[PDB]
Amino acid sequence: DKPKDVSSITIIPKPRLGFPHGKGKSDAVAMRVNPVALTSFQDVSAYPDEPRTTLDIARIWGLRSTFNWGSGDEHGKELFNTVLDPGLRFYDQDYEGQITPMEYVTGLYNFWSGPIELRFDFVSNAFHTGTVIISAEYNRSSTNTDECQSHSTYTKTFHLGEQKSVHFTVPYIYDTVVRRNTASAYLPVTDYDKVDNVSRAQAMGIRAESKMRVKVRVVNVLRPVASTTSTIEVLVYMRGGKNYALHGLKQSTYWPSNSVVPIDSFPPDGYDP
Amino acid sequence: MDTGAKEDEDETANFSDGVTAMGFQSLDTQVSIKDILRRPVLLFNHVELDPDYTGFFIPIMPPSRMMQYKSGDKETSFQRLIGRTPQAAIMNLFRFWRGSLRYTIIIHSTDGHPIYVTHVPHTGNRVYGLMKVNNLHEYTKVPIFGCGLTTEMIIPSVNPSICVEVPFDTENNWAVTFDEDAQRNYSWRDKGDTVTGHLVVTPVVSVYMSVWVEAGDDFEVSNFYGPPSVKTNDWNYAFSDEH
Amino acid sequence: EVPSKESIQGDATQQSSKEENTIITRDQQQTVSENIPSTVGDLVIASSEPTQQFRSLTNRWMPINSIRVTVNGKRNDLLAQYYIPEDFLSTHAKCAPNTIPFETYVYGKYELEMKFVANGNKFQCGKVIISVKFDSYQADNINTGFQAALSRPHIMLDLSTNNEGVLKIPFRYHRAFVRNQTHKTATAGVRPGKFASIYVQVLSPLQTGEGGANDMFIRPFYRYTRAEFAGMSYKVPLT
């Protein structure tokens, strides 16, 4: 018999399946003998200690900055003062160097949120003594010479002595549940084009600069014994808090600045000396 | 990966850890490294396919600094923003990868000519672009897609695009993601360990194509290297919200 | 962990490590990196014949070259760097019994441990960082700063407290085995003897007091916690 088949359905044609997505379905065709065979990870597989998410990477302590503290720094003096924006280290100049893991990874997103952690490591010895006060300041800032304005915020006073390190969790206090990155979502400039206002007026966005700052001021002047160094370096580490969040994949704000050479064809492109 | 928590010995009081904002706006979480690597990256934007060559070669390797454009260097057929895509940024942190990659190839045409995509397993070289294998001057009688290697065909009049998944056909446990200098002439067997083979696209008549790449489902990265030295000049190209 | 009051020999509360016929004591605390896994499952396939271990020779502590740290060292400076196992065979502690098996086997899988002992005085200060980079051939000059070191398996040394540090190094390589020796008859297509790099870098410059010493020293010690050899051959001198 050759009965007619009356089954039918209306269809909407599309060229690809799951093109924009990072998960879901794919209509990829395997260049294999068996269309469903896959790579084996039975013996060779990702080591369990490798990071699995960008948040894991953001949880790695990175050295952000350093500053000096000497026996000559009078009380109230700002030893450290910075806008704490994981989106950009500077709003008025280029950055080049070893960015921290959390800033590197934050540079891939348009939004971030949650507390940020700092760790101050005083490169000193048991004969250095003094006290500093760390403060997280929001919305409105303090004068460099008005220590009291810093003391009115979220503070942690550290008594430097036998212990040479102090941890500080920077509270997340803003008028929005998340904050938008100050870097750009797309920057087509590749040849360091001398910029003008028309270029800026036609940028991908408008930089919402942060006013949130973290400062470290002298409480009790550093008083090391004469036999040791009178000035010490303080290392400032930074990483995302346990509830740090990231969202909105975009063009990476940071890019390799050292030893960058694009591939050529090997051995066709003159590898045969 | 070593978090460094081991070096944080302070145990004095701290402010609250708060509550995460993940999932507050939506459930579209985008922090999974594999999820990020599975979204497509443009490699070649409207490049030419010429039938006088064996085909256009695409080395099987994920996006990374190996394809980064540097102002002033010679012009290649690679799109210039590959080095700043989130996935290239991620790959620049992992020197090992294992598994398959998926290539989305689009032929700018509506003709009924078949365009073939042939897979070449790991053979030791690393090339890209149009090439005349063994420097001959005619390839229609000795087509690479007709030699025995796995091949798939695109027929633009039906669908000018296709998505092919290439296997991890190599002798090594892991493929090496990148080198400090992609043009250094060092030990030849090691030189070819940054790819797992090639994909070759061959047309009937001259035509253009575009190519995107992404990680397959059976894919893993490892050998975390930590972050490299970076740069940024974003600040200079936009106004702040205070004029 | 806790000091005691002074007696005839001072504060006698040292700890120590004994591995084979070698012992190393420590006066203060010690920092240790995480014990992490190596690739397993390829050994029985890459080698049709059984692989070997010689623990009494390889698992003992062997001191390598002395490292000098001076007040002129800047952050990020390389104080020392090792391509392993290569540098432990033909450049540092060359007559060590730990090197014996490498003279006759052509392949191997290696898991090590490196202990670092520093001796700065109480009026000095500074920070040094030691890290490992797996399968580093042709990728030593990138992801090579203190930042990358702080992200990879590492140990930190404070130059005035003299805490010891132990770096645990698993075998993570893109091939099943690493080749042990180069040879006039061996191929030049594959650079052998290197599956990882160890970097010793300045994190914060050494500083001293008035009329104090302008330098101090650090000494690295290595030992294999698991060295498996494959492919027996005639013995050859190392590199």
Binding site: - | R184 | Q81, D87, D140, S197
Partner: peptide
């Protein structure tokens, strides 16, 4: 020719990579 091809002799080993003895590379 291409300056990337070979590393200068004073900074490299026989394998055309930085020598582990060459500390100034950073």
């Amino acid at each position: 020719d291409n300056p990337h091809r070979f590393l200068p002799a004073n900074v490299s080993n026989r394998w055309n990579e930085y020598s582990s003895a060459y500390l100034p590379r950073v």
